[PDB]
Write a protein that binds this ligand. Structure first.
Ligand SMILES: CC(C)(COP(=O)(O)OP(=O)(O)OC[C@H]1O[C@@H](n2cnc3c(N)ncnc32)[C@H](O)[C@H]1OP(=O)(O)O)[C@@H](O)C(=O)NCCC(=O)NCCS
Ligand SMILES: CC(C)(COP(=O)(O)OP(=O)(O)OC[C@H]1O[C@@H](n2cnc3c(N)ncnc32)[C@H](O)[C@H]1OP(=O)(O)O)[C@@H](O)C(=O)NCCC(=O)NCCS
Ligand SMILES: NC[C@H]1O[C@H](O[C@H]2[C@H](O[C@@H]3O[C@H](CO)[C@@H](O)[C@H]3O)[C@@H](O)[C@H](N)C[C@@H]2N)[C@H](N)[C@@H](O)[C@@H]1O
Ligand SMILES: NC[C@H]1O[C@H](O[C@H]2[C@H](O[C@@H]3O[C@H](CO)[C@@H](O)[C@H]3O)[C@@H](O)[C@H](N)C[C@@H]2N)[C@H](N)[C@@H](O)[C@@H]1O
Ligand code: NI
Lengths: 147, 145
């Protein structure tokens, strides 16, 4: 059956939020709401929803980052902020298409590089990033200190 | 041992220290990076001097995008720090980071962050000793568009 990757607009907010809560549980509910609104008005944020037969089966959040991005040599960079495909629809090339949409968006925005990150423990994610043409650049430990 | 924010006069020596921190970075880029830092409001480097000679530096930025482990924005980010071996373990880095931290606070950052290689044992101890807590460990990927 035919699938479409739609850049998220107001009409897909509920499809998006319903999936996003499955990728990041306990990311606060109020946060999804605000995030959705922020994204709809941004020029450096965009999200994409995989739709087929009227249902949303997956999504990707993306951004255009001007901060230094680990492993990249140019700026700005289009960055894959999160991606999720429902269990029942995996290994069908849904993420491949969502990522192509993110790449197309960042390319049209003038980015020369697309980047992403994932836990060293997320093994399927690593296989997926590599299967899709990303090469691993570096691994780092992040630190935080309250100001 | 004074710490000063970098200006045009410190570029040549900063570049010499910076090439030792990152030998793989094109010399060509140190040139452009220095100009970029001085032109941008969201960037600042600090130089530690002994008898008028630069012996350490820290590059920093105000980051506005997502930063792993942080929950607020902007974030002051320690982009790199280096102290000549002869001056190590004397609190120079501690001092450089204090200066980065004040700059950040004055820019409204509620969090300061940094990152380092899993292999950089010494760096890890330094971060810990200075009050940073480890947040996440990740692998980065890149695909040329
Ligand atoms: C990671 C994820 C988004 C991939 O979605 P997907 O739609 O199943 O991926 P695709 O079908 O487009 O797969 C692309 C490629 O990755 C590879 N791949 C996908 N799943 C794989 C698996 N489980 N094991 C090994 N390789 C796999 C394949 O090499 C290749 O497709 P093909 O060999 O079947 O021809 C999905 O597993 C998911 O939602 N996981 C949980 C959320 C998550 O971990 N996100 C990652 C970072 S936010
Ligand atoms: C990392 C580096 C900048 C630290 O510089 P420094 O001036 O020697 O550090 P400081 O003296 O200010 O030390 C501050 C804290 O780190 C600790 N520390 C410093 N060097 C240490 C070492 N080699 N092993 C264990 N702990 C160490 C100090 O004991 C502690 O002080 P405290 O008494 O307040 O706890 C320096 O070792 C260096 O330039 N390394 C090479 C470049 C690199 O690794 N950069 C880091 C990532 S960008
Ligand atoms: N590739 C997926 C990435 O997901 C998380 O980071 C995202 C972040 O997720 C937060 O982190 C928790 C999961 O660790 C979620 O609950 C959110 O609050 C999200 O809120 C931002 N809008 C975009 C960030 N990229 C991870 N922090 C990061 O390590 C991981 O690499
Ligand atoms: N705290 C040290 C950090 O240094 C490097 O990242 C810096 C980056 O260094 C590039 O990466 C190579 C070393 O990996 C250098 O040759 C430059 O090209 C520099 O060019 C940017 N101006 C600021 C980045 N923070 C590392 N990429 C990062 O992993 C590391 O944790
Ligand atoms: Ni279609």
């Amino acid at each position: 059956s035919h699938m479409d990757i739609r850049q998220m607009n107001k009409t897909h907010l509920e499809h998006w939020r319903g999936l996003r809560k499955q990728l990041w549980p306990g990311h606060p509910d109020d946060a999804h709401l605000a995030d959705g609104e922020e994204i709809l008005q941004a020029d450096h944020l965009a999200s994409f929803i995989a739709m087929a037969d009227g249902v949303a089966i997956g999504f990707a959040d993306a951004s255009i980052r001007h901060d230094y991005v680990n492993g990249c040599d140019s700026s700005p960079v289009v960055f894959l902020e999160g991606i999720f495909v429902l269990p029942s629809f995996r290994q069908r090339g849904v993420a491949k298409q969502l990522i192509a949409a993110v790449q197309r968006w960042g390319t049209n925005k003038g980015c020369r590089e697309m980047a992403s990150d994932t836990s060293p423990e997320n093994t399927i994610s690593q296989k997926v990033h590599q299967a899709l043409g990303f090469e691993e650049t570096e691994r780092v430990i992040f630190y935080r200190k309250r100001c």
